[PDB]
Paper text:
In Gram-positive pathogens such as Staphylococcus aureus (Sa) and Enterococcus faecalis (Ef), the pleiotropic transcription factor CodY plays a key role in integrating metabolism and virulence factor expression. CodY DNA-binding is activated by two types of ligands: branched chain amino acids (BCAAs, i.e. isoleucine, leucine, and valine) and, in most cases, guanosine triphosphate, GTP. Each 30 kDa protomer comprises the N-terminal ligand-binding domain called GAF (cGMP-specific phosphodiesterases, adenylyl cyclases and FhlA). The GAF domain is connected by an extended linker helix to the C-terminal DNA-binding (DBD) domain that contains a winged helix-turn-helix (wHTH) motif.
Unexpectedly however, the structures revealed a previously undescribed monomeric form of SaCodY and a dimeric EfCodY. The GAF domains of the ligand-free EfCodY protomers pack with close to perfect 2-fold symmetry. However, this symmetry breaks down in the C-terminal part of the linker helices as well as the DBD domains, which all assume different orientations in the four protomers in the asymmetric unit. Furthermore, for protomer chain C, parts of the linker helix and the DBD domain could not be modelled (residues 181–260). This evidenced the flexibility of them in the ligand-free EfCodY, in consistency with previous structures of CodY. In ligand-free EfCodY, residues Leu60-Gln78/Glu55-Ser73 (EfCodY/SaCodY sequence numbering = shift –5) form an extended loop with a few loop residues involved in crystal contacts. The fold of the loop in all four protomers is identical even though the crystal contacts are not identical, suggesting that the loop structure in the crystal structure also represents the structure in solution. The most apparent difference of the loop structure to that in SaCodY is the absence of helix H3. Nevertheless, Lys74 (Arg69 in SaCodY) extends into the vacant Leu binding pocket.
Numbering used by the authors:
A (entry chain B): -1 to 260
B (entry chain A): -1 to 259
Amino acid sequence: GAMATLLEKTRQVNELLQKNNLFDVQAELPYNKMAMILGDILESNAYIISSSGDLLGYTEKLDVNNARIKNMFKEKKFPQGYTEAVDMLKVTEANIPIDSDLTAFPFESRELYPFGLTTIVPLYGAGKRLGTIILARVEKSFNEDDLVLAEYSATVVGMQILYHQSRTIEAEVRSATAVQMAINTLSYSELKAVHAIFEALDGEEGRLTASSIADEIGITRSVIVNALRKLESAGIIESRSLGMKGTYLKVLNQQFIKELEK
Amino acid sequence: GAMATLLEKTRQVNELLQKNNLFDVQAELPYNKMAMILGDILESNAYIISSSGDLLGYTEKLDVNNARIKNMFKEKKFPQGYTEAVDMLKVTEANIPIDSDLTAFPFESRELYPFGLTTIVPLYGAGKRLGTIILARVEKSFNEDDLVLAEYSATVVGMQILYHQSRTIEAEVRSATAVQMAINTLSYSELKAVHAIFEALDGEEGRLTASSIADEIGITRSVIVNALRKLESAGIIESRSLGMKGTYLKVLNQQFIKELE
């Protein structure tokens, strides 16, 4: 039955994607396996795009009988602006024809697959946009059965993404709060000093002559140094004394500069 | 339109639960609103059980006719071990009759609800058991349309639970790193000052006089104030100066005192 068929597919999705962790560390794309499962169950080509527009994984059915080794290693790339455009879609769009710029088919293929259809499914979970799932079928349309399964699949993918994010979050906030406290522990004296330090110390890593720079900024010569010992003891940079040459520094938290240029 | 009906319901679930954050902080149960939405769309009473067997939220349809304003305040309680038992179910079990011990209906109602049916839906996401959703209907059976919707609903709830877990780790590590690094910026002097500052406060808010603290503990004021502007710049207390009268402070990180003691 249509409903029994749909149900069994949702069960297959559950067994394969809800009851397993599918983040492939060291894969070409971390979610290629997840995309493959989705494309199989949904009988589609499938692409998983992060909330920032990065392709996280995809599956395209290979034409085995006509395969050519030269063509098999080509990386799928979406046209300039496609990932930003899909992000503007806030609800599912189904059966997008190939003449739309939202088609998942390369634009060269518009002639080859005039009836190719694309369905774009925003991934929302817990109020957040988590990315987007894109499905493409050369021949069949997406019916209402397919849309339910697609929406079901998006939530399962959303959970995988939310779970992967959770494993990172502890180390992320530890570093952000550290940057924030180090920024707070600064005066105008040391801060505009720090600003110029990263300016001269271009590349994030390089040598520095704190004394010389002091003149460049019109800041007291002890004040310049106070920012240094604060940041390094706070744990954001590394230093070794070069003697007359100066002191050589190393940026250890790269999100710092983003917070200071804000 | 059986399929169109299901799709519209999944979309209502999306609009209401996928596109909103639904953790009711400082509420009775954080997921009471989530349970109500689910019970509405699934035409059931609904219970949300955490991975550890704690009831996180539920909704039961009130009968206006027999309402007693005092009986409306009773906390829902399951037979001991029921919430732990449901965790041993690893796949959905639907249309559980009232004669089973896994029924969601209290047994007192078992006489009044001959056809009461219970459906238990494990919440799995990303390989983890995230809890369980329990659905109860007076009579109508859970057909395949309902199970699809129910399974759909379970993933959506799972996302909420997972999202809350990450925001709980985020706020904990934010508070620990803030407290601990603030301690590291304190000398023997500044520590002994802050200690008595919190003793003087005695609780999360209060008034204190910087001069007096120096006199009471024998540390020059500069040290006392150096610690204050340190704690306030670190973002652990809020302050407004009353001048000669003194200074008013507010504890913003309550796990600080535990770490200092």
